[PDB]
Amino acid sequence: HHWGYGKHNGPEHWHKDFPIAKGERQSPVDIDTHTAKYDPSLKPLSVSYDQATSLRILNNGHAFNVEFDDSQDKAVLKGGPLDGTYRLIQFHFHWGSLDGQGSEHTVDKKKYAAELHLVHWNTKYGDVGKAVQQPDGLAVLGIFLKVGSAKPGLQKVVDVLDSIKTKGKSADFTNFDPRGLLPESLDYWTYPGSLTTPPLLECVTWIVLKEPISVSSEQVLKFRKLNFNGEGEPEELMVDNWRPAQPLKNRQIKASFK
């Protein structure tokens, strides 16, 4: 019926309902570090999340989103390859059933345990709905998660997963600081792409950070205990909610570092 990540409604089937799946600037892609162009004109990212107002966390089937109040320029992203101000609307993760898979983007074919996506929308468009209809409507900050030492800033997220085990569940999630999920360095790669889930709109400027953050095995394990299904339905563990790398086509991956 609806799309998913299973054998019968997974990524290989999406093109039937969303023709854009075989488009020209689809994501994710493999970042070949030896062919990525170091661009001296790329400016440093400006991540201002000091006034971020998280509101709730919900399991929407597919993944879990932490939503933010984007009624005003509270948490924004500017700089880098971006033009204008982009407001943070939500963040979510993609992870695997095993530590050796989970990320959507790969670096030199290397997959990480998971990938964090901080989704922002261009303010010049007034609302997210309009922004998705534009080639530069969204900017997603992608951060790789590697299994190692626990990330303290991620623990609040992990503790609440129990209350949103199944599809449709949500819980109040206020006062969460997104800054706790950032690596030390903001060096990044960038390329024009798309949403990695249906509708797969090609409205995204991807900003993938070079430095991954580390999370403990216990932290990643809790992600894996979530359910794709809603209460009262057969249990399907929410794992491997990632889309395989797509062809780069006529695109150039630029790097903010040499």
Ligand SMILES: NS(=O)(=O)c1ccc(C(=O)NCc2cccc(F)c2F)cc1
């Ligand atoms: N993993 S990712 O960062 O690429 C990604 C980010 C956001 C969304 C999203 O907001 N989807 C819902 C959505 C999007 C467009 C139009 C809609 F109607 C809608 F519901 C999907 C994928």
Ligand SMILES: [Hg+2]
């Ligand atoms: Hg678009």
Ligand SMILES: [Zn+2]
């Ligand atoms: Zn995502």
